[PDB]
């Protein structure tokens with residue numbers, strides 16, 4: 143646009159209300175827009191005499207030219223150099239003071255709430271907190287005296303813009319719409335880039351970031367963004383100046399942002415010897431801020447959050463895979479390259495472009511191949527990286543330490559760099575930092591790692607704001623806080639189950655099923671009835687029935703060895719619950735029972751699956767939720783072949799499922815001292831992360847109304863203190879869960895021609911999940927009846943078992 147730069151920044155420096163063109167600007171971002179008034183540098187970016195008071199400046203006559211002041215009036219003006227009281231008034235630096243618990247806010251008159259200051263650092267890898275501790279005394283003091291996690295998990299892709307905006311919104315990138323550092327939106331026909339103007343257009347930025355949430359609810363906010371050429375000392379001095387505004391003008395929430403250490407980590411690698419200085423310099427900035435807060439008498443008033451967007455891995459030019467080494471048609475695709483790949487057609491007019499032949503040419507083609515291709519709907523569900531038109535159908539998950547590129551010339555005609563990021567957000571090198579310090583956070587407290595999507599809710603709690611709807615799980619981080627906790631109630635059950643008894647004769651069933659089960663006792667007759675009425679339910683249902691949170695028709699079915707919630711609408715269980723003790727034995731499916739399927743006389747023929755549909759469907763087979771291999775006795779084993787325990791499974795998937803049920807469950811019970819397993823189907827044909835309704839299902843077992851699941855989940859719970867068996871646990875729980883994709887081939891697993899012991903568990907690890915992910919995908923609410931606090935349970939449901947080594 144045209145800008146009238148002849149206006150002036152006199153008394154407007156770093157103003158909080160931004161003006162519209164063509165009026166010239168004086169705010170945090172005027173440089174980015176090439177719109178600052180002609181005198182912005184002279185007036186707003188003063189540099190004279192640098193950033194520190196020296197003995198001889200103490201008591202100086204004010205000179206407005208100076209970058210900051212050391213005259214007696216500077217405290218009332220709010221513009222002293224940050225080291226003023228130290229140099230001139232005999233005070234100590236904040237870092238040199240002992241830490242002393244902050245039990246309540248100690249704020250100046252006129253403060254309505256403790257302000258929040260967010261200190262965000264780009265590329266600050268979680269292990270810097272230990273490895274660089276010697277050179278970061280201010281940051282170490284925040285970390286040791288406040289509340290810290292050993293690391294914080296970013297979202298995928300572990301790039302800057304998606305993570306910073308997740309921090310501000312509590313949303314996954316697929317929902318807020320910033321899905322990469324580079325993007326094409328085909329509806330707009332527009333491209334987003336780190337450099338340039340298109341990124342300022344509001345149509346890219348979805349959701350509601352913290353500054354808008356605050357402004358809408360009457361809490362003023364500093365501007366969160368800083369043009370890159372504004373030096374960091376100036377950004378700090380601006381925050382400090384704002385905090386001296388009159389009460390009715392002063393914001394309550396502020397952000398600082400640093401481009402370091404990311405900037406240097408790209409050039410030198412995460413641990414290059416050149417990295418020490420950027421760490422020292424960021425620590426010095428922290429010290430400027432705390433020193434500035436101590437002079438304003440705000441150092442035992444403000445909550446400070448020190449938070450990073452993602453880490454940094456070692457990545458060099460020579461670890462690049464070229465699509466030109468796989469594809470014949472390389473000029474017919476556009477690639478978004480680097481630590482992830484995104485592919486789409488170069489021309490929508492090219493009718494010979496085919497995603498299936500592209501994926502196939504990219505699948506397991508070279509022995510040590512350093513990237514795997516996925517249609518976006520098949521990416522692990524924990525990445526939540528599919529529901530957006532800006533995410534290309536074909537995705538490449540790139541191994542840590544590697545890049546992908548289209549052709550070799552892209553790499554040397556577009557080595558240089560030693561570091562990069564963007565990989566799978568489970569990767570250790572990508573993890574980042576969280577420290578919270580201040581009256582509202584706990585004192586000298588370590589909390590377990592958590593996801594960055596959770597922080598928005600917490601920042602809203604710190605400011606007394608109602609968060610906009612987001613993907614955090616509100617209350618899961620209550621353990622970080624001394625006060626302002628959020629105490630939610632469990633959601634209300636929407637559908638109550640039916641408890642059917644025996645209602646049908648065997649001959650009513652014409653399902654085409656057969657079983658060799660006819661062999662003829664008042665000891666064992668009473669016992670079979672008791673088991674069907676729920677007498678073993680407390681052994682197998684350890685945490686209450688899951689609640690169904692939508693409107694549906696379902697039955698509770700009890701059995702000796704397992705309990706299920708059977709849907710009359712989907713014709714299979716929503717959930718199947720069972721406990722396997724350490725002592726449990728594994729058995730085979732007896733030869734006479736290989737193809738046995740048995741009608742369930744509790745459930746009508748009309749609400750049952752049928753075996754004839756599976757016979758006729760030449761692609762589809764079936765498996766069982768509660769595994770027949772883990773029956774408690776020969777007699778109990780018959781229950782496992784009920785038609786109501788059956789679910790549709792591709793033969794390729796049954797290789798995965800059978801290995802999990804036959805080998806892995808018993809292994810986990812041995813290692814964890816018993817496990818409780820809840821397993822079930824998931825239907826997400828629109829890949830939105832949320833339970834599909836019946837009318838969304840795209841595939842059925844041929845000739846039938848039996849819907850085919852897109853995924854199968856399991857939730858595996860035991861006692862955190864593994865000296866107690868899973869079924870007699872007095873304290874906190876431990877959980878691992880997975881959401882396995884239900885696919886007709888094992889193309890994802892390049893070693894699949896081998897024995898299941900060489901590949902299946904590696905697949906399961908890749909599809910690890912939070913209980914909360916399963917909740918969203920099924921409309922079920924787990925752990926309704928424990929002895930544990932609800933916030934503790936919320937934390938357990940956000941846990942992700944990552945399988946990475948120790949940081």
Ligand SMILES: *[C@@H]1O[C@H](CO)[C@@H](O[C@@H]2O[C@H](CO)[C@@H](O[C@@H]3O[C@H](CO[C@H]4O[C@H](CO)[C@@H](O)[C@H](O[C@H]5O[C@H](CO)[C@@H](O)[C@H](O)[C@@H]5O[C@H]5O[C@H](CO)[C@@H](O)[C@H](O)[C@@H]5O)[C@@H]4O)[C@@H](O)[C@H](O[C@H]4O[C@H](CO)[C@@H](O)[C@H](O)[C@@H]4O[C@H]4O[C@H](CO)[C@@H](O)[C@H](O)[C@@H]4O)[C@@H]3O)[C@H](O)[C@H]2NC(C)=O)[C@H](O)[C@H]1NC(C)=O
Nearest residue numbers: 316317318319347348349529530531611612613830831918
């Ligand atoms: C993580 O948390 C978030 C936040 O809670 C969850 O996302 C929410 O999920 C809801 C369900 O998917 C969804 O609710 C829908 O909202 C529709 C209104 O949408 C606009 O308004 C809201 C409110 O301000 C706004 O936030 C939305 O912003 C989205 O869209 C703009 C683009 O215009 C983006 O800039 C922004 O980034 C965001 O995009 C994301 O969501 C959209 C979908 O809304 C996706 O398409 C994107 O890919 C991206 O992920 C919008 O501006 C409302 O219209 C919907 O109601 C429809 O469906 C119901 C059925 O219940 C029906 O009764 C209605 O009539 C209506 O159907 C009609 O339209 C259909 C489609 O055209 C048509 O087929 C029918 O025939 C009907 O005519 C619905 O209520 C909510 O929008 C998002 N919010 C956000 C911020 O993403 C997310 O689910 C959580 N994730 C997990 C895994 O838990």
Ligand SMILES: CNC(=O)C[C@H](NC(=O)COc1c(CN2CC(F)(F)C2)cccc1OC)c1cccc(Br)c1
Nearest residue numbers: 174260262303306307309310366367368369370397399
């Ligand atoms: C070279 N600098 C950059 O690439 C990033 C710089 N970002 C910032 O100043 C503040 O960062 C963000 C912040 C700051 N928030 C603080 C927080 F931790 F909550 C995240 C929120 C949302 C998006 C952000 O950047 C995309 C910035 C500067 C100018 C314009 C934009 Br758009 C973004």
Ligand SMILES: [Br-]
Nearest residue numbers: 341342347367
């Ligand atoms: Br913006």
Ligand SMILES: [Ca+2]
Nearest residue numbers: 826832833834
């Ligand atoms: Ca869905």
Ligand SMILES: [Cl-]
Nearest residue numbers: 301322323324
């Ligand atoms: Cl990107």
Ligand code: NA
Nearest residue numbers: 756759762763
């Ligand atoms: Na079949």
Ligand code: NA
Nearest residue numbers: 888889891894
């Ligand atoms: Na394979």
Ligand SMILES: [Zn+2]
Nearest residue numbers: 265302404408
């Ligand atoms: Zn970077």
